[PDB]
Structure formats: structure tokens, C-alpha cells
Amino acid sequence: AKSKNHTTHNQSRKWHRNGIKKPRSQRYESLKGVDPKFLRNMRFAKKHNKKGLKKMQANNAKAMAARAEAIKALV
Amino acid sequence: APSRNGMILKPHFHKDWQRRVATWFNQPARKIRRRKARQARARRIAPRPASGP
Amino acid sequence: GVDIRHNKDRKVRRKEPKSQDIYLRLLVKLYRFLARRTNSTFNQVVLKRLFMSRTNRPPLSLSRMIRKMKLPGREGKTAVVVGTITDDVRVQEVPKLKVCALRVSSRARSRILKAGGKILTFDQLALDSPKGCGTVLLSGPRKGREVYRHFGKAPGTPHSHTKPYVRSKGRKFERARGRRASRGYKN
Amino acid sequence: TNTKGKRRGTRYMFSRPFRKHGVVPLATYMRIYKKGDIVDIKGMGTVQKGMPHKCYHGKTGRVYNVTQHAVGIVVNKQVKGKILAKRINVRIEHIKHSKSRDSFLKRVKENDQKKKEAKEKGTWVQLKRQPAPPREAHFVRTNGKEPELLEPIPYEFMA
Amino acid sequence: VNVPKTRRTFCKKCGKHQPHKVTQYKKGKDSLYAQGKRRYDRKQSGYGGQTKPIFRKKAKTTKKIVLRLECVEPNCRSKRMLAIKRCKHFELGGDKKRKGQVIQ
RNA sequence: GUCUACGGCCAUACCACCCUGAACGCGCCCGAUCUCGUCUGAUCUCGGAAGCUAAGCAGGGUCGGGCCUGGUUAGUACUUGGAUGGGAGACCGCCUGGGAAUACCGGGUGCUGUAGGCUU
RNA sequence: UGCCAGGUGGGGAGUUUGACUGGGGCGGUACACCUGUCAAACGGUAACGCAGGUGUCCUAAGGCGAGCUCAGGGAGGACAGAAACCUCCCGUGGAGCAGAAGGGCAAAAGCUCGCUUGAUCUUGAUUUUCAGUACGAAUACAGACCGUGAAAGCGGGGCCUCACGAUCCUUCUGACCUUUUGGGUUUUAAGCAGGAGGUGUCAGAAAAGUUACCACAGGGAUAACUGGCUUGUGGCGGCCAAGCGUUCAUAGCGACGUCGCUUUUUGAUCCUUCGAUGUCGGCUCUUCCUAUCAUUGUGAAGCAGAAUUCACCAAGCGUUGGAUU
RNA sequence: GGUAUAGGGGCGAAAGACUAAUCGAACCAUCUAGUAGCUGGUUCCCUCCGAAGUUUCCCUCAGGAUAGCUGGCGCUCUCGCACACGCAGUUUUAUCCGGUAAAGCGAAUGAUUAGAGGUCUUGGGGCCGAAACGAUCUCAACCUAUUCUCAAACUUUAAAUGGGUAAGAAGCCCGGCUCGCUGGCGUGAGCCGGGCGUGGAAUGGAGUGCCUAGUGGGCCACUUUUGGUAAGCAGAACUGGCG
RNA sequence: GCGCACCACCGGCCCGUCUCGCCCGCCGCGCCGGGGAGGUGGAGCACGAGCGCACGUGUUAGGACCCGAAAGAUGGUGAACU
Ligand SMILES: [Mg+2]
Ligand SMILES: [Mg+2]
Ligand SMILES: [Mg+2]
Ligand SMILES: [Mg+2]
Ligand SMILES: [Mg+2]
Ligand SMILES: [Mg+2]
Ligand SMILES: [Mg+2]
Ligand SMILES: [Mg+2]
Ligand SMILES: [Mg+2]
Ligand SMILES: [Mg+2]
Ligand SMILES: [Mg+2]
Ligand SMILES: [Mg+2]
Ligand SMILES: [Mg+2]
Ligand SMILES: [Mg+2]
Ligand SMILES: [Mg+2]
Ligand SMILES: [Mg+2]
Ligand SMILES: [Mg+2]
Ligand SMILES: [Mg+2]
Ligand SMILES: [Mg+2]
Ligand SMILES: [Mg+2]
Ligand SMILES: [Mg+2]
Ligand SMILES: [Mg+2]
Ligand SMILES: [Zn+2]
């Protein structure tokens, strides 16, 4: 009682019935699989981002004032 | 046969359990009989507490 | 002879509530009129959420509603909930809020009225704000039920954190060959 | 049935071309690969370490990780039902920059130039590409000479 | 295969590379009082015959060699097991073979 | 025009023979106390500047081989899709598109980056 | 005699006696793996397809650094010749890299040296088969101890593609580790983590036959008939013409080659039939076919007569009695 | 006629024979509605959607588990409510991959035919020679320029068909902060602020989550193709059908 | 602009384990107890959603959609045939 061994005859129709999908690309992909040293450095950099925030605030305020002055000069 | 993530269950129904099924249709009659016996015992000891010692 | 697939022609979304209670039917009729007539989409959202089932409108906690109303800008606005407002016991200070919900718990109702807030029904909301102006629409956590902890990637699969269906948790019921590196392998 | 060997069927795929054996040129070793760089993988038989699998040969992916002498590339792979975005570690010698994205970058820069320019002019320029249009009807001038006749050639057996 | 009698490798207790003595690991005695052995003896007692399987389909003709590395540093004497690929001939200090000689 | 040191692409750069090299440079070359290694200062290493283009090296030449790039081969071989096309078959023609490779015949025989020389 | 212990004990009891398979058995492993082809220029793809290989081996045949070039050929030198050793030249690798094959490698990945044991300890991530689960194998990292080289660097086994193993149990190694239950100490024991002892039917039962005295549930998924496709084989018929025929290829034959027909032989297939289609022969009887043995009518001769064979229309009518099986 | 031997027992001049029409283990009742991956059957209507005989594992091959195909229930959003994101058994424009068809063997490996020039080399039969590479050919493996025919496990070349990516807002251009990483200054990555929108053609509304039956014997055909003389034979690839 | 629910990512917290370390307290100063940083393992936290009843579907243990063996065991009846 020998039977059929292997085939791929009807498989393509089954694959294409339910809309074969390209993998869903999502913004901000995960960081799994990256070297630990680089991740450690990134974590340390993000840990101290809050430090020296007033410098960023002052620089942003100065830039906003300069942009407003430039807009007024243009007008 | 398991099928796509069901619990692993082990029912204890491999003996002849249907031979020893205990119904509870006697429950209201049992309660009535107990109440009648309790009232009769309370009446037997007229001044003593019905609860007991 | 036209080659068109008919497998996705019938949409499955609800058109009417499955419940047979008559007060919900009256609210459904009122908001059907409001949504089909007024151009406001708030009435459409309220109608759709009224059609939803019990699990699709999870209860909203008092603390979560207070925190959402704490956001700047949405001050002096009426809270609109299509679920049930439930009391939260691990919070002490409750401000005054205007809330609209199908059901309010007795503890939550007492605490809201004690603080000086107002509790309204949807028929009162229609009279007060027929177009839903000046209202904040909120809902409870949809994924709050314990069923979703069992959903997703199957247990016994690498990088999976799904709770398996176990009769009882213990030392000798699971966490063996398949989960121990000393017993065969682990995922 | 066939064997499950990793390098089965790679007799010619992982083979150096004709008269191109020997020392690997050093230009490929000193090319940088930033994150988000589109890269096409081509295996090289000279280097055995960091060898990509035969199914990724000729595929194109994006770099997401970098090591001392290898990079991590996410490459789409179809397995009988779907396309899987999977990440692999490939050494530098089997890695080269893809030139598909540079044409798009050049067109983007040209479009930005054409947007900054001709803006004060007021005339909007065509930025979108278009397929080949009709051949812009013209005149053909047969000065003097008449067209040459081309009669069919009678058959003759040559073999 | 041939391996030397001394092996200067890492020592977990010392924390550094130390010379180690190389000896071949051997099976010990069942001790007659392990929980599994006691359970097996209780199960085999009485009637019913043999209760557990007896393997009778040996296929492999060799066993994996295990090396017993003992730290030679005093006050440590830490042992460790190392397994090497299967081989049917093993020795210690076995004839370093003096490459480039006359064979007879 | 050109050379040296480090290179990039790795024969348009290779191979065989012949001719020419002004200056710097590159080498041949002169020795083994010190450094160093050999059966041998042959190689390597070190110490030098009496001779030389003899050789390497650089340029040029061969109705040169090879190599690179074209024509021919050829719309040929082959090939996607089509027919209630032919033929007993083997196979073949047509419609709709793509399109090779030998023999044979032409052209060419390294460009170039950094730093430093010579022709001042 | 009663109770234990060892031996014997098909007298008796229970059970087993794998799978694939152009039916089954026998034969083989296509049952776990690796190389080239099949395989139709991504990948993947079957047959008891083709050519093969594996269950090993290596203290160096692993890891570094240095120095050389191999196979082969030519020209020479006392014994010395085709092969002993030395010298020069040519030598893209035509040698070697343990094995089967493929790929790869020339101041190497080959040969010779010097030093070593990265064949060490520990978290994760990924690749191969894949369900994208394990095992094995491998790939980039990271944290310590190192080896080597002046250094850049290289190395956590073999240049790469294979060389191997779950639960339970036992054994070894490690922590001033946890419990050993009313408490305390000490032996013992149970745990935690990492190796080994093995399941070759290799995701892993503990397993001998016979039944023609046989039984049950099924199967035309599967054999022994006929009937179906095919015609290797069997049988029959042509095409060319080297030769036999005393001379002369074709009166009669016809090699070396080649084209056909039939299912009156055996074969290949398993399409119908296993809730049953009664088989080998012989006897009796009817009909049909012609690939004609004889008779009717004719063509040909190595046809003189007789006889003989070749061929044509032609199945109307005949094709016997017995010994042996 | 009386009596004795009763079911793993009896009895047997031995046939597995007889033991109440049953004997290679009698009859009666119960365990028992024993088990069956194996046959057969499985009861009203209409409407809507609608399959597979395929991958992996199993003492697995008449069966299961697991992926695949199917149905149901939803949910999150966009809008012919003058005002569109995103996806495709498509094509176009760019940019990578291959080693099959073909072709070649005057190019490598292997097979192989025949003539010209070679004491290249040596050797066998031989002839003119005591012999002589002195003359003449011949057969051996080789060479120098030619020549005939080949390769699924050969190849310098090399298609058609085909397989990945890119065709913008998740993109660019500036300013400033953080870093136990790497560095002579530098990198590289991550954080905040600001400015710039139709990114080839044509067609589609999409995304996402739970349960889930049946299936897991297939067959045929154009084309490519393996074994076999061939087969309405056995076995593969693409597509389309019957089922 | 405030931004539900939800999704993706980056951070934070809890328990086990590994590495490097600096300090805190006492009734009993010890083989005492506690804390940090950096990886990793968990069916976790990160302002909740369960409980009870009823209905439907799917998987099981039961006789288990219905009918069907060749068998096995316990207790009894037969030599009126042979
Ligand atoms: Mg009481
Ligand atoms: Mg006993
Ligand atoms: Mg027996
Ligand atoms: Mg069988
Ligand atoms: Mg091929
Ligand atoms: Mg293909
Ligand atoms: Mg070297
Ligand atoms: Mg390391
Ligand atoms: Mg017999
Ligand atoms: Mg059949
Ligand atoms: Mg024949
Ligand atoms: Mg006559
Ligand atoms: Mg008998
Ligand atoms: Mg039944
Ligand atoms: Mg079965
Ligand atoms: Mg539907
Ligand atoms: Mg339909
Ligand atoms: Mg061909
Ligand atoms: Mg059917
Ligand atoms: Mg279920
Ligand atoms: Mg029955
Ligand atoms: Mg039995
Ligand atoms: Zn030690």
C-alpha cells in the first residue's frame, strides 16, 4: 500500500488566499540583539539627559527670541 | 486528545462512580425532621435552655 | 460571470444591542435619532459604545477618571462613560466632577455627591448637551481582564511571557522539563 | 530526499569568479555601514567565518547593529506562508553597499533644489516622474534617395 | 587521543589560571541508600516480577571521556569535570611521537 | 616630463626577446668588531660609499602570445505568453515580446591618492 | 513440620515477537546524518534515483609568531642505473591541507621551527531543520583569567559544509548554600547548578517462533483468475542487398542494419471484483478468424513426366483410430 | 441396568478423537452496555459563507498532535457629509543575485578520430646492416601547429523566464544638550526646539484579537522533467481544472 | 492644544541568580543584619475587575451518537449421546 510522498501543488493558492503580508514595519523598532556595551553607553547617556536641562531651556528660549526677531525683521 | 491550549485535566471518574451517587432530595425533609426533633426536645425540658449546658 | 470574492462582503459589526432590557433600548433610540440627525460624531461614538457588549465597555475606576480630568485644559467638563463608574478605595481626595454613566456604584455615587459633584444619565446629557459639547469621553482599560494574559504567543515558545492554563500553581505542577535548563531545555 | 546540509547546493554560489581568487581586496574592509543603511548580501567563499546562509544570498536588508568586524542586518525571508523580518549576523567581506537608494537620494536632492529654486519665479516645475510618453510626432526627411527594397532571400541548404 | 598529565587552566575557586592534575573520571558505587535505589528495591519486593525496564539494545561502542582536573594550589584542591569527544583509545602522557623520525 | 615611500582599483598592469636611461632617487656593490642568524655574512642583521648601469627598475619596439574593449557570427541558437496550427510520431512553422556564445576581423597595452625629491 | 534464603523449574501462567516495501516473505535501509547531480540560473522540491561517505581521528592534525615553497619536467655531478643525495632553471598551485565529495587557500589555510593549552569560567542575542519547538552544529557580542607576537592583532578546538542523544534513575564536581520539620549538635539523606553513564527503530517500549486445527474486524488502499494499457520476450511479415545457390543478389534463401503487426506465450501495472464472478485438464456441443494442411480456379521455377516447394482469389467442405502421461 | 472419572478438567488400541445435534478447551448466569485507530447507519425547510488530501513529530503508514486551508463573534480607525492614510500572485524607472537553455573544448578536467613536422622520449616486432640515433617505415605512450565528434555529477562565456530591495513625513535642513562607549582634536548613538508636504502608472477601504469544524488516501491536463521498451505505469516543478 | 482605549518603543519598581564594590545599625559587635551599580531569569507592579447565575460552542472522564467481535475472569450444571 504505497502512497504519495511529497508535493507542493495546491499550496500557492492557500498561501495567497489570506493575503500574504509583508511583515508589519513599526516605528521605533526594538533594541534586542545589539551589543551590550553600546546599550550600556546609551542607557548611561539617557540616564543623565535630565542633568543640564536648564542649559537646553535657556538655549531654546534664546533661539525662540532670535527667530521671533528675525520674523519681525522680515515683516 | 488535546486541542490548542486547553487545561490538563484529570477527572476522578474512572471507578464505577454511578453506583455510589448520593442525591440530596432528602435535604428539606431532613431539615424538617431536625426542626421537629429540636422543638420536641426543647418542649421536654420546659424551663431548661434548649441549647444545652 | 464576474470574479469577485464574497468571503468578506458581510460586515460583522453590531447594529443593535443584544440585551433585551428596555431602558437601554430607549437610550439607543434617543441616540439613534441624535446621531442620524445631528452632524456631531460624539453621538455616533456614544451609539456605537451603547451597542457594545459587557467586555467591550470595562468599568472605569474613580482614580483613573480623576487623573484624566486632572489634565490641563479639560477643566469644568462633563465626564461621559458608557460603562460603569466604580469606587476606588486607595484614593483619599476626590474633587467635584460632572459624570455621565449607565451605572454608578453606591460607594462611588456617595463619594461623588459628598465632594459636591453631579451625576447625570444619558437622557439628561441629551437635554443638557445634545451635541456633546464641552464633554470628555473616557473608557476603562479594555485589556484589563485576565483573559488577555493567556492570549498571544503560546507558552513554551522562546521570548514568550504568556500565562499557561494550569489547574493550580505550585512546585510540582509546572516549571520542569521545558522550563528548566537542568531539565532538558528552557525557552 | 535531500540532506539538510548548511552549504548544500553552494558549489557555484560560494565560489570565487574566474581569475579573481587569492587575497581579498582591502577596499571592502574599510567601508563604513551606519545604522539604517540598505545593504545587499553576497557570500564570499574565501572567508569562512561570518558566512551567511545560502537563503540570504542576493537578498537586501537594513543594518541595525555593528560589531568590530561584522554588522547585523534585518532581511525579509518568506517561509511558505508569509514573509518574516529576521535579523542575521554577517561579516564585512560578505557585505556591500546597495546602490538602489542612492538614485532616490539624488532625485530627492534635485527635487529640493527645484523646490527652493523657481519658487520666487512663480512657475511650478514638474517634479514627479512619468513613464515614457508617445514619441512626439515629427517629420522624416528622405533627401533625394528613395527607400531601399528588401526582398526575401530564397532558401538554400547550407548544412 | 592523548592528553598530558598536567593542565594549566582556569580555576573557579582561585579565580586565575593555575596548574591542574589530570586524571580520568570513573563511575562510583551506588551507595545502596539513594532515594531512587530505595524506591526501586521496595517496588521490586513482593510479587509481580520485574517492574522497571532493562535496556538491552546497546548501540554505541564507546563512552565520552571525562577529565578530573584537580587544582594543585594548596588550600584550594578544587576539582572540576571536563568532557572530551568520544574515543576508543585514551592515555595520559602518551608518547609525544617526536615528529620527523624513522618509523619501523 | 619623471622618481622615491605608503597605497586604491588588481594583466590596458602579465610573459618572451631587443633598444634607451640626463639629474635626484632606487639598487648592484665593499666587509663582519658591535646587534643578529646560518653547514656557508648565500639569506637576514649590522658597519659603509671605491666602481656601475652589467642586472633589478623606468620608458619604448615586436604585422608577438595573453589580456581589455568592439564588429561579424545573428535577429542565428535559445526563450515568456497563444492557437480546435501542421505531422502517425520524431519534431517543425506562425502570432506576441526578449535575445546569446565560438571560429573570423578591428582598436588599446595602466589610470590614480597622500607626502617628499630631480629636471633648479 | 513452620518461616526465610540460594539453585533448578515451558510442568503451569501472563506477554511480546518494529517499520518502509511497485502484495507479503526473503533481499536492502532509501529509519539518524554529510557531498555532487537530479533540480527546470533566488530559495525549497519525489522514487528501493544516480556516484559516494559517517558513528572515527588528533597534546597535535588545537592557538599564536617567524622562515620557506609544492606536484611535475629539463640540464648536470664517483659508485648511482627509471627511482638513494647534491646544484641550477621552468613551474597559478596541475601538490598538500586525516577521511567521502564540493568550495577555498602561495612570503597560506601547505612544510619546518619557538612558546603555549581560547579544547578555560559565566550571562544573554542570532543562524541551520523548523511548528519557526527542542537536540546537534554554527555565527556575531559582552564580562574575567590567559597564550602568543615588537606590535597591530589573532585564539573561547580542528579552513567550511556531518561525525551524535529527552524525562526518570545512578555517579562526580561547587558553595563556611537550603531543608532534614518541637528545639540544638553530629553522621546520613533530600535539594540547587554544571559534566558523565543511553536509548543506531538515533524527538528515545524492557520483547523469540509456529499454526495445513485456527478465529475476529476489515481491505479490491494489497496479492493468486479473467478482463483492461504496453509488447521487453514469444509468434508472424516487410525494406537495402554482402553473399549461398556449378555461372547469376532477388527460381528458392539471405548476413551486417532497419521498419512493422497479433495478444493463440511468458512478462510489467494494480484499473474492476475480497458482505465470494466456483480454477487445471479431459468429455460433449455450437459458432467464429485466417497467419491455407488438403480439395476448387490460377500464376513460378535450379517445373522434361512424376514429385516438389514459392505466391494469388479463397474458410465452402474436411483435418482420424490408438500405446505412455 | 447400576456405579466411578467434570472443563485447563475427565477420558482416549491416539483421530486433537469424545465429553447430551457445540470440542485445538462443554453448557448456564454475572463482571458486561468489555475494547475496536475497523465496517454500517445517523431523522424538518430556507438563507449566507465555504474547504483539504499539504509541512514537522509520533513502533508513525486505514490513526493522531501540530502548522496550513474554513466559519463565527467582534473591536480600532478613514470616508461622496467638496476636502484620504495604508496594502497589492500588476507594470515602469533604478540597483543587486544566479550558472539553466545555448555555446566551447584551436580555453582548464575527462572522453575521442585522422592526417603533416618531431632519433624531443625511450621500447616491441621487423627489413638493408656483425652493429651503428647510418637509410626506410611500423606499432607504444608524448610533443609542435591542425582536424572529426561529446559531458546530469566539465567549463572561459552566457540568456529568456525569475528572486530581493528603493520610488519621502516613520523624509530631509539647521540649533543645543547627555554619554562609566570609542577617540589627539574627533567619533557614534540618544535626547529636546525650529523650518520645509500630493514624491512613477493604474486598481483597491484597511488594521487587529479571540474561539473554531472538516481535512491530513487524491486524480487529470499544457509546459519542464526522473526510472522503465512501453503502459490508462511509478515519481517531481508551475499553472488550471475534476474532486 | 488637552489628549480616552489600544499598539510600538525608551525608562522605573518587585523576587531568583551572576560580576564589581563602598558603606551603615545593634540588647547580645558575630561565619550578624541592611543598602548600591551593572547584565540576566519570572505565568509580575506600573491607580483594579472580579464574583455569582444563565445561555451557546469546543475538548475530555464517564456506557458517552447507535449497533457489532476473535477474547479474559468469578460462581455453578451436566457421563439420559459418547
Ligand atoms: Mg447546636
Ligand atoms: Mg520475595
Ligand atoms: Mg507459555
Ligand atoms: Mg509491513
Ligand atoms: Mg545546478
Ligand atoms: Mg527555479
Ligand atoms: Mg606565516
Ligand atoms: Mg572574550
Ligand atoms: Mg500436518
Ligand atoms: Mg485495486
Ligand atoms: Mg520480437
Ligand atoms: Mg509436376
Ligand atoms: Mg494432526
Ligand atoms: Mg455502545
Ligand atoms: Mg489504523
Ligand atoms: Mg462570511
Ligand atoms: Mg459562495
Ligand atoms: Mg547543454
Ligand atoms: Mg472525497
Ligand atoms: Mg477549546
Ligand atoms: Mg458487545
Ligand atoms: Mg489476557
Ligand atoms: Zn584553585
Swiss-Prot record, chain A:
One GO CC annotation: cytosolic large ribosomal subunit
Subcellular localization(s) per the UniProt record: Cytoplasm
Keywords: Acetylation, Cytoplasm, Methylation, Phosphoprotein, Repeat, Ribonucleoprotein, Ribosomal protein
Modified residues (N6-acetyllysine): K32
N6-methyllysine modification, residue list: K4
Phosphoserine carried by residues: S30
UniProt GO BP: cytoplasmic translation
Chief place where the protein resides: cytoplasm
Positions of the UniProt region annotated as Disordered: 1-32
Compositional bias segments (type: Basic residues): 1-25
GO molecular function terms listed in the Swiss-Prot or TrEMBL record: structural constituent of ribosome
Keyword Flavoprotein: no
Subunit structure: Component of the large ribosomal subunit.
Function: Component of the large ribosomal subunit. The ribosome is a large ribonucleoprotein complex responsible for the synthesis of proteins in the cell.
Family statement drawn from the similarity comment of this UniProt entry: Belongs to the eukaryotic ribosomal protein eL29 family.
Protein name as catalogued: Large ribosomal subunit protein eL29
Record organism: Oryctolagus cuniculus (Rabbit)
Gene for this chain: RPL29
From Swiss-Prot, chain D:
Biased composition (Basic and acidic residues): 111-122, 135-144
PROSITE patterns for the chain: RIBOSOMAL_L21E (PS01171)
A Pfam cross-reference name: Ribosomal_L21e
Compartmental location: Cytoplasm, Cytosol; Cytoplasm; Endoplasmic reticulum
Region (Disordered): 111-144
GO CC annotations, alphabetized: cytosol; endoplasmic reticulum; ribonucleoprotein complex; ribosome
Keyword Cytoplasm belongs to the record: yes
GO biological process: translation
Signal peptide positions (record): none
Keywords: Cytoplasm, Endoplasmic reticulum, Ribonucleoprotein, Ribosomal protein
GO molecular function, one term: structural constituent of ribosome
Role summary: Component of the large ribosomal subunit. The ribosome is a large ribonucleoprotein complex responsible for the synthesis of proteins in the cell.
Family label: Belongs to the eukaryotic ribosomal protein eL21 family.
Subunit structure: Component of the large ribosomal subunit.
Protein name listed in UniProt: Large ribosomal subunit protein eL21
Organism of this sequence: Oryctolagus cuniculus
